[PDB]
mmCIF file of C-alpha atoms and ligand atoms in Angstrom:
data_model
loop_
_atom_site.group_PDB
_atom_site.id
_atom_site.type_symbol
_atom_site.label_atom_id
_atom_site.label_comp_id
_atom_site.label_asym_id
_atom_site.label_seq_id
_atom_site.Cartn_x
_atom_site.Cartn_y
_atom_site.Cartn_z
ATOM 1 C CA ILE A 1 152.051 -138.320 -123.816
ATOM 2 C CA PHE A 2 152.852 -135.935 -126.737
ATOM 3 C CA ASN A 3 156.014 -135.901 -128.775
ATOM 4 C CA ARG A 4 157.020 -132.391 -129.966
ATOM 5 C CA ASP A 5 158.631 -129.118 -128.725
ATOM 6 C CA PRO A 6 156.208 -127.569 -126.117
ATOM 7 C CA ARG A 7 157.478 -124.095 -127.228
ATOM 8 C CA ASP A 8 155.148 -124.720 -130.265
ATOM 9 C CA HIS A 9 152.146 -124.559 -127.888
ATOM 10 C CA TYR A 10 153.624 -122.395 -124.940
ATOM 11 C CA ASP A 11 155.747 -119.278 -124.192
ATOM 12 C CA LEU A 12 158.395 -119.556 -121.402
ATOM 13 C CA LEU A 13 158.424 -116.631 -118.931
ATOM 14 C CA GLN A 14 160.660 -117.433 -115.872
ATOM 15 C CA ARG A 15 162.513 -120.197 -113.930
ATOM 16 C CA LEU A 16 161.158 -120.823 -110.378
ATOM 17 C CA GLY A 17 163.425 -123.290 -108.535
ATOM 18 C CA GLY A 18 163.665 -127.135 -108.585
ATOM 19 C CA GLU A 19 163.812 -126.400 -113.517
ATOM 20 C CA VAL A 20 160.096 -125.582 -113.229
ATOM 21 C CA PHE A 21 158.913 -122.755 -115.502
ATOM 22 C CA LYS A 22 156.301 -120.020 -115.458
ATOM 23 C CA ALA A 23 154.657 -120.099 -118.917
ATOM 24 C CA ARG A 24 151.575 -119.006 -120.942
ATOM 25 C CA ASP A 25 149.512 -120.866 -123.595
ATOM 26 C CA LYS A 26 150.070 -119.077 -126.957
ATOM 27 C CA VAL A 27 146.469 -119.890 -128.106
ATOM 28 C CA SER A 28 144.334 -120.168 -124.921
ATOM 29 C CA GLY A 29 145.997 -117.329 -122.895
ATOM 30 C CA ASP A 30 146.069 -119.532 -119.760
ATOM 31 C CA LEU A 31 149.110 -119.494 -117.512
ATOM 32 C CA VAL A 32 150.754 -122.879 -116.965
ATOM 33 C CA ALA A 33 153.557 -124.509 -115.035
ATOM 34 C CA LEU A 34 156.029 -126.585 -117.089
ATOM 35 C CA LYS A 35 158.024 -129.107 -114.972
ATOM 36 C CA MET A 36 161.062 -130.069 -117.151
ATOM 37 C CA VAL A 37 163.209 -133.243 -116.611
ATOM 38 C CA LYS A 38 166.535 -134.080 -118.355
ATOM 39 C CA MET A 39 166.836 -137.651 -119.760
ATOM 40 C CA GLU A 40 170.385 -138.695 -120.729
ATOM 41 C CA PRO A 41 171.468 -142.377 -121.058
ATOM 42 C CA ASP A 42 168.797 -145.150 -120.608
ATOM 43 C CA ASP A 43 165.635 -143.489 -119.273
ATOM 44 C CA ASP A 44 162.367 -144.893 -120.689
ATOM 45 C CA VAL A 45 159.314 -142.608 -120.764
ATOM 46 C CA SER A 46 157.088 -145.632 -121.617
ATOM 47 C CA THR A 47 157.575 -146.965 -118.024
ATOM 48 C CA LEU A 48 155.876 -143.740 -116.672
ATOM 49 C CA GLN A 49 152.620 -144.494 -118.641
ATOM 50 C CA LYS A 50 150.708 -146.175 -115.769
ATOM 51 C CA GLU A 51 151.647 -143.171 -113.487
ATOM 52 C CA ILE A 52 150.722 -140.499 -116.134
ATOM 53 C CA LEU A 53 147.305 -142.238 -116.713
ATOM 54 C CA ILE A 54 146.760 -142.056 -112.899
ATOM 55 C CA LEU A 55 147.608 -138.306 -113.045
ATOM 56 C CA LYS A 56 145.457 -137.624 -116.174
ATOM 57 C CA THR A 57 142.238 -139.269 -114.837
ATOM 58 C CA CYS A 58 142.590 -137.151 -111.636
ATOM 59 C CA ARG A 59 139.908 -134.485 -112.209
ATOM 60 C CA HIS A 60 139.230 -132.644 -108.887
ATOM 61 C CA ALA A 61 139.314 -129.022 -107.658
ATOM 62 C CA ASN A 62 141.916 -129.866 -104.926
ATOM 63 C CA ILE A 63 144.328 -131.676 -107.335
ATOM 64 C CA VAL A 64 146.716 -129.724 -109.641
ATOM 65 C CA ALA A 65 145.268 -130.273 -113.114
ATOM 66 C CA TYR A 66 147.435 -132.347 -115.462
ATOM 67 C CA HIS A 67 147.286 -131.094 -119.055
ATOM 68 C CA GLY A 68 149.724 -133.452 -120.918
ATOM 69 C CA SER A 69 153.445 -134.240 -121.276
ATOM 70 C CA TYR A 70 155.967 -133.407 -124.037
ATOM 71 C CA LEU A 71 159.006 -135.562 -124.936
ATOM 72 C CA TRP A 72 161.449 -133.520 -127.091
ATOM 73 C CA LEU A 73 165.280 -133.223 -127.321
ATOM 74 C CA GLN A 74 165.854 -135.787 -124.516
ATOM 75 C CA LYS A 75 163.614 -133.772 -122.127
ATOM 76 C CA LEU A 76 160.223 -134.488 -120.509
ATOM 77 C CA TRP A 77 158.111 -131.341 -120.053
ATOM 78 C CA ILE A 78 155.133 -132.034 -117.747
ATOM 79 C CA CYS A 79 152.512 -129.282 -118.203
ATOM 80 C CA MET A 80 150.252 -128.273 -115.324
ATOM 81 C CA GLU A 81 147.842 -125.752 -113.761
ATOM 82 C CA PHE A 82 149.871 -122.725 -112.455
ATOM 83 C CA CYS A 83 149.738 -121.850 -108.699
ATOM 84 C CA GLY A 84 151.293 -118.355 -108.448
ATOM 85 C CA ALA A 85 151.821 -118.287 -104.606
ATOM 86 C CA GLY A 86 153.902 -121.446 -104.683
ATOM 87 C CA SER A 87 153.851 -124.053 -101.970
ATOM 88 C CA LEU A 88 152.911 -123.591 -98.369
ATOM 89 C CA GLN A 89 156.617 -124.115 -97.654
ATOM 90 C CA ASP A 90 157.533 -121.260 -100.039
ATOM 91 C CA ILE A 91 155.029 -119.001 -98.244
ATOM 92 C CA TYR A 92 155.735 -119.829 -94.534
ATOM 93 C CA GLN A 93 159.496 -119.362 -95.076
ATOM 94 C CA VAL A 94 158.584 -115.658 -95.588
ATOM 95 C CA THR A 95 155.316 -115.361 -93.574
ATOM 96 C CA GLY A 96 156.189 -117.472 -90.516
ATOM 97 C CA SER A 97 153.741 -119.970 -89.081
ATOM 98 C CA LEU A 98 150.106 -120.281 -90.078
ATOM 99 C CA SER A 99 147.179 -119.623 -87.736
ATOM 100 C CA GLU A 100 145.132 -122.614 -86.518
ATOM 101 C CA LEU A 101 142.196 -121.537 -88.783
ATOM 102 C CA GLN A 102 144.451 -121.212 -91.834
ATOM 103 C CA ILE A 103 145.789 -124.682 -91.059
ATOM 104 C CA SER A 104 142.188 -125.914 -90.544
ATOM 105 C CA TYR A 105 141.137 -124.719 -94.044
ATOM 106 C CA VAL A 106 144.291 -126.215 -95.599
ATOM 107 C CA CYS A 107 143.579 -129.561 -93.863
ATOM 108 C CA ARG A 108 139.978 -129.724 -95.125
ATOM 109 C CA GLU A 109 141.017 -128.942 -98.726
ATOM 110 C CA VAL A 110 143.838 -131.512 -98.564
ATOM 111 C CA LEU A 111 141.420 -134.053 -97.053
ATOM 112 C CA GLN A 112 139.000 -133.360 -99.934
ATOM 113 C CA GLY A 113 141.752 -134.101 -102.508
ATOM 114 C CA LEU A 114 142.877 -137.230 -100.597
ATOM 115 C CA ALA A 115 139.248 -138.458 -100.281
ATOM 116 C CA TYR A 116 138.931 -138.218 -104.057
ATOM 117 C CA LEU A 117 142.356 -139.861 -104.736
ATOM 118 C CA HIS A 118 141.553 -142.683 -102.252
ATOM 119 C CA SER A 119 138.100 -143.439 -103.815
ATOM 120 C CA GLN A 120 140.037 -144.015 -107.092
ATOM 121 C CA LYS A 121 142.418 -146.482 -105.232
ATOM 122 C CA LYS A 122 145.375 -144.052 -105.615
ATOM 123 C CA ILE A 123 147.821 -143.002 -102.868
ATOM 124 C CA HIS A 124 149.563 -139.582 -102.773
ATOM 125 C CA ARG A 125 152.646 -140.765 -100.784
ATOM 126 C CA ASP A 126 154.467 -137.367 -100.374
ATOM 127 C CA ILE A 127 152.003 -135.125 -98.466
ATOM 128 C CA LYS A 128 153.960 -132.147 -97.101
ATOM 129 C CA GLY A 129 153.955 -128.310 -97.228
ATOM 130 C CA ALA A 130 156.177 -128.280 -100.354
ATOM 131 C CA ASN A 131 153.509 -130.294 -102.273
ATOM 132 C CA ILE A 132 150.468 -128.225 -101.161
ATOM 133 C CA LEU A 133 150.254 -125.434 -103.716
ATOM 134 C CA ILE A 134 148.276 -122.195 -103.408
ATOM 135 C CA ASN A 135 146.824 -120.127 -106.255
ATOM 136 C CA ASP A 136 146.313 -116.357 -106.140
ATOM 137 C CA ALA A 137 142.623 -116.999 -105.225
ATOM 138 C CA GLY A 138 143.769 -118.800 -101.982
ATOM 139 C CA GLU A 139 142.648 -122.261 -103.184
ATOM 140 C CA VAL A 140 144.541 -125.396 -102.305
ATOM 141 C CA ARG A 141 145.995 -127.793 -104.904
ATOM 142 C CA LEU A 142 147.944 -131.041 -104.254
ATOM 143 C CA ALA A 143 150.942 -131.404 -106.640
ATOM 144 C CA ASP A 144 151.976 -134.443 -108.772
ATOM 145 C CA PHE A 145 152.691 -137.841 -107.221
ATOM 146 C CA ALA A 146 159.756 -140.335 -108.182
ATOM 147 C CA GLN A 147 160.047 -143.236 -110.696
ATOM 148 C CA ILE A 148 162.845 -141.698 -112.841
ATOM 149 C CA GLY A 149 166.516 -140.936 -113.259
ATOM 150 C CA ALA A 150 168.980 -140.394 -110.403
ATOM 151 C CA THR A 151 166.043 -140.567 -107.905
ATOM 152 C CA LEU A 152 164.851 -144.065 -108.986
ATOM 153 C CA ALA A 153 168.529 -145.052 -109.243
ATOM 154 C CA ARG A 154 169.308 -144.093 -105.585
ATOM 155 C CA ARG A 155 166.025 -145.517 -104.102
ATOM 156 C CA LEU A 156 166.491 -149.073 -105.318
ATOM 157 C CA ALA A 157 170.248 -149.013 -104.429
ATOM 158 C CA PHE A 158 169.022 -149.821 -100.874
ATOM 159 C CA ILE A 159 166.404 -152.510 -101.557
ATOM 160 C CA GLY A 160 168.734 -154.538 -103.803
ATOM 161 C CA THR A 161 169.758 -154.759 -107.442
ATOM 162 C CA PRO A 162 166.609 -154.999 -109.705
ATOM 163 C CA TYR A 163 167.515 -157.915 -111.983
ATOM 164 C CA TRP A 164 168.247 -160.187 -108.954
ATOM 165 C CA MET A 165 165.137 -159.207 -106.887
ATOM 166 C CA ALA A 166 162.251 -161.635 -106.203
ATOM 167 C CA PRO A 167 158.602 -160.669 -107.158
ATOM 168 C CA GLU A 168 157.655 -159.880 -103.522
ATOM 169 C CA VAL A 169 160.692 -157.521 -103.315
ATOM 170 C CA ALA A 170 159.816 -155.903 -106.667
ATOM 171 C CA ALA A 171 156.219 -155.317 -105.440
ATOM 172 C CA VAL A 172 157.469 -153.556 -102.342
ATOM 173 C CA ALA A 173 160.157 -151.663 -104.264
ATOM 174 C CA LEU A 174 157.628 -150.087 -106.689
ATOM 175 C CA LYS A 175 154.624 -149.533 -104.392
ATOM 176 C CA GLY A 176 155.679 -150.047 -100.724
ATOM 177 C CA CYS A 177 152.897 -152.572 -99.790
ATOM 178 C CA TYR A 178 151.282 -149.918 -97.592
ATOM 179 C CA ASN A 179 147.872 -148.285 -97.835
ATOM 180 C CA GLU A 180 146.014 -144.976 -98.423
ATOM 181 C CA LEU A 181 145.938 -144.250 -94.675
ATOM 182 C CA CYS A 182 149.664 -143.317 -94.844
ATOM 183 C CA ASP A 183 148.593 -139.965 -96.392
ATOM 184 C CA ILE A 184 146.388 -139.261 -93.313
ATOM 185 C CA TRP A 185 149.512 -139.660 -91.119
ATOM 186 C CA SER A 186 151.504 -137.382 -93.470
ATOM 187 C CA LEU A 187 148.786 -134.691 -93.210
ATOM 188 C CA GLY A 188 149.088 -134.746 -89.414
ATOM 189 C CA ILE A 189 152.829 -134.122 -89.718
ATOM 190 C CA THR A 190 152.105 -131.352 -92.314
ATOM 191 C CA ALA A 191 149.718 -129.658 -89.823
ATOM 192 C CA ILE A 192 152.574 -129.544 -87.234
ATOM 193 C CA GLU A 193 154.947 -128.286 -89.975
ATOM 194 C CA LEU A 194 152.590 -125.422 -90.850
ATOM 195 C CA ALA A 195 152.136 -124.672 -87.155
ATOM 196 C CA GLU A 196 155.882 -124.733 -86.287
ATOM 197 C CA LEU A 197 157.875 -124.137 -89.620
ATOM 198 C CA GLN A 198 159.480 -127.669 -89.446
ATOM 199 C CA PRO A 199 158.113 -131.210 -89.018
ATOM 200 C CA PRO A 200 158.808 -133.158 -85.793
ATOM 201 C CA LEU A 201 162.423 -134.314 -85.550
ATOM 202 C CA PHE A 202 163.824 -132.062 -88.409
ATOM 203 C CA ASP A 203 167.059 -131.662 -86.360
ATOM 204 C CA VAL A 204 167.313 -135.518 -85.950
ATOM 205 C CA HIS A 205 168.951 -137.815 -88.585
ATOM 206 C CA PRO A 206 166.302 -139.291 -91.014
ATOM 207 C CA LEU A 207 167.341 -142.909 -90.548
ATOM 208 C CA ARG A 208 167.085 -142.691 -86.775
ATOM 209 C CA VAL A 209 163.631 -141.072 -87.165
ATOM 210 C CA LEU A 210 162.579 -144.131 -89.248
ATOM 211 C CA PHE A 211 164.171 -146.632 -86.895
ATOM 212 C CA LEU A 212 162.419 -145.227 -83.814
ATOM 213 C CA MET A 213 158.949 -145.455 -85.477
ATOM 214 C CA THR A 214 159.382 -149.284 -85.559
ATOM 215 C CA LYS A 215 160.347 -149.617 -81.858
ATOM 216 C CA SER A 216 158.027 -150.701 -79.054
ATOM 217 C CA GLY A 217 157.007 -147.774 -76.831
ATOM 218 C CA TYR A 218 157.124 -145.346 -79.789
ATOM 219 C CA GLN A 219 155.107 -142.179 -79.179
ATOM 220 C CA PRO A 220 153.708 -140.292 -82.177
ATOM 221 C CA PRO A 221 154.741 -136.579 -82.153
ATOM 222 C CA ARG A 222 152.684 -133.677 -80.802
ATOM 223 C CA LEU A 223 152.350 -129.932 -81.016
ATOM 224 C CA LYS A 224 155.164 -128.296 -79.029
ATOM 225 C CA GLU A 225 153.180 -125.488 -77.290
ATOM 226 C CA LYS A 226 150.040 -126.858 -75.529
ATOM 227 C CA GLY A 227 148.328 -123.509 -74.815
ATOM 228 C CA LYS A 228 148.721 -121.960 -78.298
ATOM 229 C CA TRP A 229 146.194 -124.387 -79.917
ATOM 230 C CA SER A 230 142.650 -125.576 -79.281
ATOM 231 C CA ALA A 231 141.932 -129.060 -77.899
ATOM 232 C CA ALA A 232 140.227 -129.737 -81.271
ATOM 233 C CA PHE A 233 143.536 -129.143 -83.103
ATOM 234 C CA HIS A 234 145.411 -131.304 -80.508
ATOM 235 C CA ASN A 235 142.775 -134.012 -81.211
ATOM 236 C CA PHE A 236 143.175 -133.681 -85.015
ATOM 237 C CA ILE A 237 146.926 -134.347 -84.494
ATOM 238 C CA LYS A 238 146.315 -137.257 -82.053
ATOM 239 C CA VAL A 239 143.933 -139.004 -84.422
ATOM 240 C CA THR A 240 145.784 -138.481 -87.750
ATOM 241 C CA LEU A 241 149.005 -139.620 -86.055
ATOM 242 C CA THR A 242 147.520 -142.965 -84.942
ATOM 243 C CA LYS A 243 150.404 -145.455 -84.922
ATOM 244 C CA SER A 244 148.448 -148.442 -86.292
ATOM 245 C CA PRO A 245 147.052 -148.195 -89.864
ATOM 246 C CA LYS A 246 144.190 -150.494 -88.655
ATOM 247 C CA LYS A 247 143.020 -147.772 -86.188
ATOM 248 C CA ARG A 248 143.949 -144.580 -88.184
ATOM 249 C CA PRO A 249 140.810 -142.998 -89.688
ATOM 250 C CA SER A 250 140.068 -142.429 -93.378
ATOM 251 C CA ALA A 251 140.079 -139.137 -95.265
ATOM 252 C CA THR A 252 136.254 -139.078 -95.465
ATOM 253 C CA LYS A 253 136.014 -139.886 -91.702
ATOM 254 C CA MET A 254 138.498 -137.002 -91.084
ATOM 255 C CA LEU A 255 136.197 -134.603 -92.991
ATOM 256 C CA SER A 256 133.678 -135.154 -90.076
ATOM 257 C CA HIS A 257 136.263 -133.886 -87.513
ATOM 258 C CA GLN A 258 135.438 -130.605 -85.681
ATOM 259 C CA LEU A 259 138.645 -128.899 -86.852
ATOM 260 C CA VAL A 260 137.793 -129.281 -90.594
ATOM 261 C CA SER A 261 133.926 -129.299 -90.416
ATOM 262 C CA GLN A 262 133.684 -125.995 -88.450
ATOM 263 C CA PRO A 263 132.053 -123.019 -90.216
ATOM 264 C CA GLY A 264 134.001 -120.024 -91.538
ATOM 265 C CA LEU A 265 136.754 -122.034 -93.225
ATOM 266 C CA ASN A 266 137.286 -120.545 -96.732
ATOM 267 C CA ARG A 267 139.969 -119.130 -99.071
ATOM 268 C CA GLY A 268 139.784 -115.662 -97.435
ATOM 269 C CA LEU A 269 141.954 -117.103 -94.590
ATOM 270 C CA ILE A 270 144.690 -117.725 -97.209
ATOM 271 C CA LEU A 271 144.033 -114.298 -98.918
ATOM 272 C CA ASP A 272 145.179 -112.887 -95.544
ATOM 273 C CA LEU A 273 148.210 -115.136 -95.760
ATOM 274 C CA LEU A 274 149.079 -113.900 -99.281
ATOM 275 C CA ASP A 275 148.620 -110.301 -98.165
ATOM 276 C CA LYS A 276 151.055 -111.006 -95.286
ATOM 277 C CA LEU A 277 153.558 -112.480 -97.808
ATOM 278 C CA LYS A 278 153.509 -109.248 -99.856
ATOM 279 C CA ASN A 279 153.826 -107.087 -96.657
ATOM 280 C CA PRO A 280 156.047 -109.301 -94.355
HETATM 281 C C1 LIG B 1 155.980 -128.443 -106.052
HETATM 282 C C2 LIG B 1 156.945 -128.919 -107.114
HETATM 283 C C3 LIG B 1 158.075 -129.656 -106.738
HETATM 284 C C4 LIG B 1 158.984 -130.108 -107.696
HETATM 285 C C5 LIG B 1 158.774 -129.826 -109.045
HETATM 286 C C6 LIG B 1 157.655 -129.093 -109.440
HETATM 287 F F1 LIG B 1 157.466 -128.833 -110.748
HETATM 288 C C7 LIG B 1 156.727 -128.619 -108.486
HETATM 289 C C8 LIG B 1 155.531 -127.842 -108.944
HETATM 290 C C9 LIG B 1 155.498 -126.443 -108.806
HETATM 291 C C10 LIG B 1 154.374 -125.681 -109.219
HETATM 292 C C11 LIG B 1 153.284 -126.386 -109.809
HETATM 293 C C12 LIG B 1 152.284 -125.393 -110.134
HETATM 294 N N1 LIG B 1 152.727 -124.229 -109.770
HETATM 295 N N2 LIG B 1 154.006 -124.332 -109.221
HETATM 296 C C13 LIG B 1 154.695 -123.205 -108.718
HETATM 297 C C14 LIG B 1 154.541 -121.942 -109.300
HETATM 298 C C15 LIG B 1 155.206 -120.822 -108.790
HETATM 299 C C16 LIG B 1 156.043 -120.901 -107.654
HETATM 300 N N3 LIG B 1 156.711 -119.725 -107.178
HETATM 301 C C17 LIG B 1 157.832 -119.926 -106.221
HETATM 302 C C18 LIG B 1 158.628 -118.637 -105.976
HETATM 303 N N4 LIG B 1 157.725 -117.547 -105.563
HETATM 304 C C19 LIG B 1 158.470 -116.326 -105.171
HETATM 305 C C20 LIG B 1 156.669 -117.313 -106.571
HETATM 306 C C21 LIG B 1 155.838 -118.588 -106.783
HETATM 307 C C22 LIG B 1 156.180 -122.185 -107.069
HETATM 308 C C23 LIG B 1 155.510 -123.296 -107.577
HETATM 309 C C24 LIG B 1 153.309 -127.784 -109.960
HETATM 310 C C25 LIG B 1 154.415 -128.522 -109.523
HETATM 311 C C26 LIG B 1 154.384 -129.946 -109.687
HETATM 312 N N5 LIG B 1 154.376 -131.077 -109.824
#
């Protein structure tokens, strides 16, 4: 983590949403994304060092490249590879729902990133449309993977108060005790999201959604229209949304599934999508 004004090395161009910036390298000419974070009272950047070193050693085509961080004037600027189409959520809010094939390509590319992340003993944890970014070439990039500020404040005010927590609580509070196969589940939900513009139960209260998942006789969600999709896509959803982690398949096992291993899946499918965005 570097320790100077990133304006020295980069030129700001425009705000995007939520304060992420379009920017260009003054020397290299490469476009970048700068994710900025305010840091007021008693934030410590040195507690994000194990999570930055996870993000730095991630070197894969389907992961957003990390380029370095900048602490300056009580602000943390995280620099990254720019994806000019935004997230799949940004796109589908204009385009409407994705075709099965477009979803199939997305799922394979996401699976490829997850396979890589899992082989390194890393877990993504927040797989959804908003974190699947798309470049102008129609390639698929997973975004950064929480432990800071008002977010880390709120999250623990739930589990307990940190100074009074036991080690077993602490362990759960930081990491969740759960495994890589959680991302496989999250992908299955994302495939429904892309298909239907919302995940299952988006009109239901989040806590009740969580509660029901723990109850006996729980049924994992499904695609709403049966006839719109192939049996292969219905199977992809069945299998990713396996209730038990013990029986849910791995990312590499999922790359053998008909839906993602079928021929003719490539970035052209998303080039159609980005054309549709421009002409909606
Ligand atoms: C996902 C995310 C959540 C929260 C904070 C964040 F910084 C990011 C985030 C956003 C990112 C990138 C890399 N590129 N972009 C990016 C670029 C342009 C656009 N726009 C939207 C409006 N359109 C009209 C044009 C296209 C959207 C997103 C990396 C992260 C990370 N990590």
